[PDB]
Design a protein around this ligand. Structure first.
Ligand SMILES: CO[C@@](NC(=O)CSCC#N)(C(=O)O)[C@@H]1N=C(C(=O)O)[C@@H](CSc2nnnn2C)CS1
Ligand SMILES: CO[C@@](NC(=O)CSCC#N)(C(=O)O)[C@@H]1N=C(C(=O)O)[C@@H](CSc2nnnn2C)CS1
Ligand SMILES: CO[C@@](NC(=O)CSCC#N)(C(=O)O)[C@@H]1N=C(C(=O)O)[C@@H](CSc2nnnn2C)CS1
Ligand SMILES: CO[C@@](NC(=O)CSCC#N)(C(=O)O)[C@@H]1N=C(C(=O)O)[C@@H](CSc2nnnn2C)CS1
Ligand SMILES: [Zn+2]
Ligand SMILES: [Zn+2]
Ligand SMILES: [Zn+2]
Ligand SMILES: [Zn+2]
Ligand SMILES: [Zn+2]
Ligand SMILES: [Zn+2]
Ligand SMILES: [Zn+2]
Ligand SMILES: [Zn+2]
Lengths: 266, 266, 266, 266
């Protein structure tokens, strides 16, 4: 008669998978992912930090761009994550196997990473990826220092329970630049009200808008560059139109309020 | 010359290890631990729930008291935890091996349980116990239902990041009784201010006092019975002097404020 | 220019995904999977055992067939595995979430199951599935007893390092029937000689042929029924043409020797 | 009346905990543990390898001896283990937190390490230590290369299921030296015959004696130095009386046969 359906692969827009050469953000900070997925390399005298890796199939491209920057596999020391979905943490397990890198994450992100994104609060098993273990668990406001660059975790639960903004200070043209890598604030197809798997979802999103609003934020970057109006294909103008953290938070909250109203009507 | 020190066992007051027979709290709820450590058995037509197990060496005693109540190993379905320290989650791994029980916990408690209490934010490796895996991760406010008894999680971070109050409604003399099993609110020898492993420790404790204050709470129980003025050795009067949740929260906050002042002076 | 390739789903022949009603093998043993993937239910007075679950998307079908047999989710006590590939262990994580079941497996199978089949010795990350944790680790020759049916593990490394045959005695028409659920002995596209990830692959396969040859084996079943000449769609004749364990082992060894010769020539 | 017993710490002979300065074994290989527990440092131009760490409380001493050798925490790349008992893998979790090191182990050792030595086949929970995760799973005969030194795994199951000998070639006075770090072959207080948790224990020990007998073995070292007649406190003569691998295997087999006979009589 009728067989069960075949497994469906997690397929994405081509631009999410379009390799790009490294794009400099500040003196030690580079976008080394694809056109439409952020993966940030921070290079220090004492090794390199990667914030996000994009999709699972991006591991070799990331290692190629690291080599182009002078970062060998042994030199990658630390992987940080915005959140542990397949399109941002996808290649972490493979990167750990192929480099010296260790993962630092909060408890929520660590348990989602360790089950490869399975049993997602909203997506079920529809978006899984190879599982990986965290080497260090971080708390809200905790700092990690690599080669003198100080990364601070700012929890901003909502998109996932473990969603995190990472902030650090780099330099540009001599001057300090406070960089904020703020996580997604979207709720794509989520049940927002009365969700039994996430009862305080709305309150957490509201607190997260306030957290993002208040980040030290000379330059905002986001896991999906379009969310902060970056255009990685635009070269010297890639960041010209970027939002402030305040504008990103306001836009996300306005969208969220509309979704709440639509959910009530639906 | 001088050898490194021997490992030091986690030793406790004798009363913490003094077995007691089951003590009834409500129609389906029993204290089945020791004189000075709580372990709550909730018996339903569809299996039993255990909230905490005490110290690691209490597993066989717990199974004996379950058998006395008519609960076989296959009948124990669910283990819930206040927090994942050795004196409350100690026997969980062994209980999982010897019973049908699965563990539900929040992400913070799950990651501490999975490392057996090692790398504790405050105690280091001084209080370790056999590690166990959680089978279900719960979110704040999430409910779990067993045989018609509904358990609600209320996160109250502080004593550990994953500290949780569990509430449920049982009956007594016909009438509903709202039971609150509130976690510890102590901070024993903790560095409270400017703690790099727990930067928002103080704000979390303050929020947790407010959470405990507001619990549905006809009867308060705590992992250390003395914290809520229970005397499990006092028979029919065991709960006569028990605090309200409001009084427990107020007392813990007053103690906390004194500790803050002492830390500033020290 | 050219984006990285999209993730490719693990797609299989339709017959592997074709639901079937329960097919009785012996008094307490039933095939409850699909036409072309084995999933064995063994029903005892003290709960049920599942050996394999097939593909990830088979969980609900398995639970439906269990209900048809009188097995509720709380009644499923134990999941055993032939090997931890996606087409045999696929739905284990979901089954653990939805039932009382605990998993027993050897160390090799447990570590592959815990990474969801990622970093496979031969397939890489091409065939991943939701990860699950084992509750009990078994050694070679160890027995597990459920409701009086005794399951014995016989390690038969090769197809995976953790490949296992499970044997038990059921009854039929009054008489004992020694059932052997022998794992796959295939090496599909494997590098057999000088494989750096599996240096003793050939010796392990040779020992495994001998193990299978010697199993107590009135009735042979295999994870892919065609490997032992079962036809689950053939009703009362489903097992009529089934191989002996000796014939299955001999056929697998002859195929293996041919593959070795082809590899040398290639 | 009578409380349950206090937890008992894993206490050991003082010499096991007696720090020693680094003792050179070959051009790049050093004993950096204690008088009576081996911990081998292998220094390469591309980072350092540690084989075993001894007891849990030895982590800081090991890091001190590494610094004395010119090995900083970032320079430690790889930890290998003989077997995952507390007196040999004790400090691995802490070393991973404090260094760049990743752990490679076989599946059996990895699952025992991940439960901190709890639920030991023979010792139960009597000898637990902080759990750690393996970063790479190795198969029998697999090689790992660091800075041009090639380490080969030789499984020798018995003392634990995952017991491993590691062999590598260093140099001395110009000439190659084949070093064999063979695991324990003891069975202290073990039930050898008919052990339900280890049914093939005897056959595995017999095979392991043969494996050890056949190792490439110009210099034998063992986790307990006394087992191979090393005296780490004897300076230039520390290794003068060391056994061959053949003599170590023969002595262990003779002791094993005596224990079997005593078990039959007991
Ligand atoms: C798991 O990944 C996501 N789901 C999918 O891929 C397919 S299912 C939902 C849909 N539809 C998710 O988490 O929902 C992506 N990640 C999001 C994020 O915010 O991280 C959103 C990005 S919206 C955006 N903002 N700027 N550009 N784009 C494209 C949705 S897409
Ligand atoms: C890991 O266990 C604890 N530490 C120790 O055992 C020894 S070290 C700290 C000291 N000293 C811990 O967590 O600090 C205990 N658990 C506490 C709790 O609140 O859970 C406190 C209970 S104070 C109390 N209230 N009523 N009765 N008692 C005795 C301290 S004792
Ligand atoms: C991960 O799953 C397997 N690979 C794939 O699905 C696609 S890639 C290899 C190819 N091609 C695998 O392990 O190789 C399957 N499982 C096998 C087994 O023996 O378990 C073999 C079964 S051959 C057979 N014997 N009777 N019927 N069939 C169909 C191959 S198919
Ligand atoms: C977990 O650790 C062991 N047990 C204990 O510590 C206390 S209980 C058993 C007793 N008694 C174990 O595994 O049994 C040690 N490790 C052994 C090994 O072979 O690894 C043996 C070493 S005998 C030796 N050979 N040369 N010197 N020594 C002292 C026994 S001692
Ligand atoms: Zn996402
Ligand atoms: Zn996304
Ligand atoms: Zn505590
Ligand atoms: Zn306590
Ligand atoms: Zn397979
Ligand atoms: Zn298969
Ligand atoms: Zn040992
Ligand atoms: Zn030892």
């Amino acid at each position: 008669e009728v067989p069960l359906p075949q497994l469906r692969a997690y397929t994405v827009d081509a631009s999410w998978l379009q390799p790009m050469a490294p794009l400099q953000i500040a003196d030690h900070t580079w976008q080394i992912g694809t056109e439409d997925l952020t993966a940030l390399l921070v290079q220090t005298p004492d090794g390199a930090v990667l914030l996000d890796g994009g999709m699972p199939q991006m591991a070799s491209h990331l290692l190629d761009n690291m080599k182009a920057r002078g970062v060998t596999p042994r030199d990658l020391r630390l992987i940080l994550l915005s959140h542990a979905h397949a399109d941002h943490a996808g290649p972490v397990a493979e990167l750990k196997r192929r480099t010296g890198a260790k993962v630092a994450a909060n408890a929520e992100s660590a348990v989602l990473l360790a089950r490869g994104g399975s049993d997602d609060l909203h997506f079920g098993d529809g978006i899984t990826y190879p599982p990986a273990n965290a080497d260090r668990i971080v708390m809200d406001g905790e700092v990690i220092t690599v080669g003198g660059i100080v990364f601070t975790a700012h929890f901003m639960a909502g998109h996932t329970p473990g969603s995190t903004a990472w902030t650090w200070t780099d330099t540009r043209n001599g001057k300090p630049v406070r960089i904020a890598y703020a996580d997604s604030l979207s709720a794509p197809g989520y049940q927002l009200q009365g969700n039994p798997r996430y009862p305080h979802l709305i309150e957490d999103y509201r607190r997260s808008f306030a957290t993002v609003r208040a980040l030290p934020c000379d330059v905002l970057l986001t896991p999906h560059p379009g969310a902060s109006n970056w255009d990685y294909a635009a070269g010297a103008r890639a960041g010209a139109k970027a939002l402030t953290c305040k504008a990103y938070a306001d836009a996300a909250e306005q969208k969220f309020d509309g979704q709440l109203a639509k959910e009530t009507a639906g």
